[PDB]
Symmetry: D3
Subunit: 338 residues, 6 copies
């Protein structure tokens, strides 16, 4: 329920009150987006972020009034190629990609794209985070983030979703990025997801999912089994298990009845998938047919706070997303300070 | 929820009358299975089938007595190797597999196993159907069925599940058999699933699922796109579409909003998966954390009625499986009669 | 030298002539390109085409006056998203690409880009041809063209260059598109190049090039041998031979001394390459250290007239390319009329 | 051009003057080859080497007699199987190849062949160098050399050509040996070609060629980029760059205008190719339709002086090859000193 | 011929005496096998082991009486699931394979099979050795052994045969297990077979067989050449050579005449094969038409004494196999004592 | 078994007597080979062929005198490059191979080689057959034969051997040419061996060999099973069976006892192998350790009579080879006749 979301919002507020009442600056490349503007309407009342819109200030304000949203009257609106830092931004993209097939004119056009300008703003500290992708497909939204902000060391870019049940939440990954991760990659995805779960003061219990129950046969079963093993080696305090079926994974009673030798007791709260088909289809089906709220996807593995909305998002979806992006922004900022 | 199930039960009873009051003979290989016996208690109350249990008669009746299930007192009990037709069953399997690495002694040992004896019984018309796999893994349960009964022509063996929502039901396949079906195979899975949906007087609307929305890129998007094309060609009367995401697939509003050129209007009620990981994980997660009853899996494509319980089944699940196994047994009976 | 080009220019003029005097309309996506503007300066004096510039009309006219090029003051300038057919163009692109991962907003942004807009103009007959790619790399320039105009049936997109020697010309293909064409693809490239050579009233004589002389060993020698064979089957009237080395191919005397069984007599004037590396590197090296004129690349296999300049082009290069583009446009116009 | 050859000949004359007046012994397997005979007339009218002819003395001397070239005189003529060291040569070949499917009779028949005899002569110091391949195809011509003389450590056999422009010369490699070299191999070829350029007191400027300008995309662009990086690591003092197009490589002005971040200034004089097709077709087309004198190929990577004439060679071509073979024999001699 | 076999027999008598009066316990899963029983008749006459038969004791007794075999009236007969150690056996198998897809019921059902019970008996020391596989194919017989007894450190499971010539004996491997062993694997098989030949106080001279004589060509020639080199490195005192042909390998005169450089003199007595076709077909053809006695196969690489009979065996074959099973059991027993 | 060989010799005498007394002309490229000459001593006494020796006449006759072989100094001796037909032979090889990387000079050098010249003589009818390879390896001897004479339509070049037992002879193929023949190829080898066996008035009974008995598993079992199937379709009058083990194949009792459904009764006399390792090693092992005489290999599938001695041949071996070569030459000549 929205118990989880309100707890998150309050955690934002304790962080903000803990830092002089400052709010995180969040860039929205899609400054003219109906759904983004409506979500922001809700979001600026509850003091969750300082929003920054990208686009022509004129038609952004004209669509704000068209949409009848008066508390957006004053929000910062930035036109990328008109910004003072534009050309240095361009020189920085060009410098990082001139041996990946990009000439200076192309760097110019790319930096004029709000997605790239946003990613660069976050990289350059002109913002604390960004939220994009309501109007474009995921790959196109995420490419500038990966090229400009990039991943931290031994991290891997991986999408993550929360499934909110009455008792607890489950975490699902990688729901958006990697088609068919290796065992090593699957373990790294488990580690990132585990750390996220720990941030909420929850004990991570991790299952490596398969169509198989503890078979270890060639292909995905041995893949998920060996993923469990690698992960366990990297973090021996954790309950991490696989290969197993999904129902075996979440249902403690089934696990105990059928596989009492298993190291995973009490049901898994972290679900790592073997390929993008299973993760993507699963989160989306649970979101539409199940009676549980699903929030995300959230992009893990990267050096700064940047999340891509799924194109099928709702206005509430965007709201939840901006909330957790704000939390993330605050968290990364503290680490930078230290 | 149970409305659909009660509808099925009444169609079982309505078919049995107008067919001489006959109940389908359903053989259960696991004659001593607790979950099977308890489910059968419910099931013989409801006049759904004549159950035939396989095992050593004294051990069967003494566990019936242990569980104190007084109405499984007169059910038929068969011991495979003591049965009159045992020796001929052995010779028929031996003639079928003597060049697939199986000698006469091995055929004897195999036919003495209840799964194989059950499969043979059904193949030979000594039973109308079978239900197995409550105690063993799916692969092991399904093997004798496939070797002995086999598929009808241009069929493909594929598991299918029902998701029961308040207004409608969804169908998911292939949830159990094929690791990584080709486009041709996926199209066939869609056709089989389609006719199952038609049996209940529902119009089949088919989505070929992917992590992509109409991208047609190399790999899974291209596979499912071309699957949609083959399926459409074989049945130009059906709404069949892909490649698409799951939420796009089921939600008519999202579809209309984002992809109005689509041939699928009003949401899909048939969901065909690109690989076993995605189908298997999806049905089990929807079943465990959503709030829909999920029934199956049911083995489609095969010449006689034979379905394998998932190892994680409950007693109630076994009851549902037997209901639809009964319906299927009846249907296949009239076809044979023709 | 200057002979081949002046003959081409004169052929453009004889074509505009028994046609009402109409000049092909050629669209240029890069309305502000210095090199494009200088080339057009030279070319409009030569009466070969009606140029159309794409871009914001004020930045175009400001670049024209800055370069002090008075003969362009008159020329048509179009801004894609302001143009009347913009939205129907958007709808036609979307309809072409909505199952290739492109949504309507994406079709709009694409059509607002001059490369796509020019491609659609040419496709829709609002222009007779296009010349692009002075400022972007070849893959990016050529993509909108293939997606929009596309190939005619069993055609294959292939870059072609003229090597202009004192007596004769050589044609080189495929110099820009296919990384590693199959034997069937090499054959189709050869036929395309052949018909181009015939257009100038020359008999096409075709060599499938390799690092080997008539070995047929596995890999490329075998590929070019079977290419030579497929080509011959599809056109038994042409001298087509391979696998052979390049000097063997161009030099008639080497051929007759060393491989008299060869079906190619008198030196090849058509050179089909085994992979993109060899064709691309070869034409560029000949152009840089050779003392012969090299023209192109020209995009063959596509249903309408559309050519992509090499990014390393000079002003004269663009002049030549536009000339032969005007020619291609006239020809394709007549074919379109006929069908 | 003419100056280049004249200077090469003069550097031979200085090497000879620096050593008592000794000229390198060069073996010609093709003792009856017309082209070889005329070219030799020229070659020690100009004091370049002591030629050794291989063949049946009577017919080599009768074709010397036919063509009326008579300070080819008492020029040394050796018949392989008649030579005193013939059986010791036979055993040395046998020891080298008895585990490569070569028996004693086979070593005998092979050693009686002038190509093998020549190679062994050079290995054993009965000669200083060899020039062959006027009458047979390159692979066969080069095989005895690679088996008998071999490569120096971490050297790689690679054909090299000079394009003589009369401002400067270019080197092209590998034009004859390797079909599809790895990035590592491309790097080693670059090093070999660089040292040859240094021999003439010129700064080697090295381009790793492609159809791409600094893209690094999968396939050859990534290959040539990673070759340039490897070579730079092995030789931090050299301008080495890639991936790039050919005209980009040779033209300094194009490079500076379009790719100013490049580490290669003033145009490349060393061109390393991604595969044999491109190199072979390039050198040959330049030689036949440009107006630039091209000399070679010359075989680099081998432990002693040995070159293979392209069968399409001219008589002057042979003269040039012998000039540089003599140069190389001298260079190797002083390096052997210390 | 049989000189070798009774020498084998009385040396068995020599250990049984050298440790009191102990006879090895040898378990026979195939208690109702006619050929096994007839063989046991001969074998219990000559005091080589204490035989244990597996099966229902009375149908074993009925088959013993029918065949009129008076010396088996006394032999121990055990029914697996009636045995005291049965469930503990089940549980230790369950623990060994629970992550390789075997649940507790499956482990129960498997342990009820004589092959598995026999393997477990030998592993747990309720027997010293086992002989199986007369009635079932080799793969099925050898599986319980590999799962239960398994391989010793870096050993590899491999079948070995003796060809008994009048002057000498040859050993052939791997005749049963590996389809296409690598060069390393071939080397390990060679080392193992070598220690077997040494046990009989014979000097092992090892040939890595091929269709080639010292060619080292790609495929099998290279593989066997490198196998010889690895083997030689692992064991520098042994004559180990290849790649070579079979006649070259066994015939010393051919070896010296045609390949005198070879490091293997006097003919090979250890023959390692490149793939299973060649070894299997070779041993069988020699046994049938070669007019020589062939004994085995014997399973090498395994931690306890366990051998699988070929299905095509005779009674005499079974007799020989049991003899050497006893020998293997005793050697292993004493080194287990250590 | 000299009965079989003397039957062969006498059947030659009847063929030559039945066509005027003409003996087949057999070319021996190795005119100076000791073993070939000693063999010819035996062979010309018994009127088996008119031998033709290749080489320089003087050193041929001088080794004939050295070896003290008086019955040979009238035998015809041909020096290839001195022969009247040399140039026409050259142009014919050249026309055959000018597009396989062979130039006219290369055609000259090849034709001057005795192996090529012998092959061309036989091809062109200047001889009836050839025998070679006593002194070189099999691939090199067989190459000119395959290039010059070639295969008849849908034939495949395959080495065949006879194993001569008391009662029976066996045929083994392909023992020398194909590394890993497809099912189609194994079938074709079976047909070729079959017609050879029919020639001696024996009924061919064909087994497709494997390490498996009727398993049909992936790899070799499936291959040999489908080979058996194809062969049966191409020759419906023959008993042809597989996959089976070698002892299964040869032993009729093992066959009926264990696989009575098998189509092969009375033991196979034609053994087709799955790969070159197995055939080659089997053939050589039977020849060295089993004492049955082994004759061959003989090259089947080719348009004219040409056989290659194994390099390990004895003199007696060569005599046998020439005998059956003569027979083959006579049969082929009658085929040519009509």
């Amino acid at each position: 329920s929205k118990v989880f979301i309100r707890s998150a919002i309050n955690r934002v507020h304790q962080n903000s009150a803990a830092n002089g009442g400052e709010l995180p600056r969040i860039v929205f490349p899609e400054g003219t987006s109906t759904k983004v503007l409506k979500a922001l309407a809700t979001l600026v009342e509850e003091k969750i972020c300082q929003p920054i819109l990208l686009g022509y200030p004129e038609r952004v304000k004209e669509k704000i009034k068209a949409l009848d949203i008066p508390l957006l009257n004053d929000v910062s609106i930035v036109h990328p190629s008109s910004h003072p830092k534009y050309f240095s931004f361009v020189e920085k993209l060009y410098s990082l990609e001139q041996r990946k097939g990009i000439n200076l004119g192309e760097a110019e056009r790319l930096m004029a794209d709000p997605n790239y300008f946003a990613a660069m703003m976050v990289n350059q500290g002109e913002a604390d985070g960004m939220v994009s992708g309501s109007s474009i497909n995921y790959a196109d939204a995420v490419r500038p983030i990966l090229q400009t902000i990039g991943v931290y060391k031994e991290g891997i870019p991986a999408g993550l979703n929360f499934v909110l049940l009455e008792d607890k939440f489950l975490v699902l990954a990688d729901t958006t990025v990697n088609l068919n991760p290796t065992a090593e990659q699957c373990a790294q995805i488990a580690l990132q997801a585990a750390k996220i779960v720990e941030y909420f003061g929850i004990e991570p219990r991790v299952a490596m999912l398969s169509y198989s129950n503890f078979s270890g046969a060639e292909g995905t079963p041995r893949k998920m089994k060996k993923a469990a093993e690698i992960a366990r080696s990297l973090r021996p305090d954790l309950m991490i298990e696989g290969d197993m079926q999904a129902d075996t994974a979440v249902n403690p009673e089934i696990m105990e009845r059928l596989f009492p030798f298993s190291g995973l007791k009490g049901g898994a709260n972290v679900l790592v998938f073997p390929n993008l088909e299973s993760s993507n289809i699963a989160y989306k089906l649970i979101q539409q047919i199940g009676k549980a709220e699903v929030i995300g996807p959230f992009l893990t593995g990267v050096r700064r706070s940047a999340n891509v909305l799924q194109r099928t998002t709702t206005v509430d979806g965007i709201v939840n997303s901006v909330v957790f992006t704000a939390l993330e922004a605050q968290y990364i900022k503290e680490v930078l300070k230290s």
